[PDB]
């Protein structure tokens, strides 16, 4: 699996794990899925400290249409925090295609333990991709979590 590769040419859809995400493009994408804005420098900080930043662009000249972002200890563990596809391109299997490339990239980097936190409405989506909730009764826990109006997975 290389770093950049055409997923389909309907317009091209390009996958990359290079991590070149412009914070203003990302802000606009998060706007489309209803996220409250946050300091651009803290978004930039979260990006440079994310081991895997994977993008989908529409190339007709580039437009960011999807992103997956994971932290990792670069050795054993990764957590995929955000998976976002532009609502204009949802229903086309792009979230699934992005996730397959994300998983393959992490395995190629020899990351063995790949995790995520799925809101109730995408649990089945990730189950179909091979994710398993609560293996052996292990629980994902949060320290005093706030109520979340917004979701981190859009496909």
Curated annotation (Swiss-Prot):
Pathway: Aromatic compound metabolism; melatonin biosynthesis; melatonin from serotonin: step 1/2. Optimum temperature is 55 degrees Celsius. Keywords: Acyltransferase, Chloroplast, Melatonin biosynthesis, Nucleus, Plastid, Transferase, Transit peptide. GO terms for cellular component: chloroplast; cytoplasm; nucleus. Expressed in roots and shoots. It comes from the Eukaryota. Plants overexpressing SNAT1 exhibit tolerance to cadmium, delayed leaf senescence, and increased grain yield due to increased panicle number. GO terms for biological process: circadian rhythm; defense response to fungus; melatonin biosynthetic process; mucilage biosynthetic process involved in seed coat development; negative regulation of seed germination; photosynthetic state transition; protein quality control for misfolded or incompletely synthesized proteins; regulation of anthocyanin metabolic process. Signal peptide: none annotated. It is an enzyme of class 2 (transferase). This is Serotonin N-acetyltransferase 1, chloroplastic.
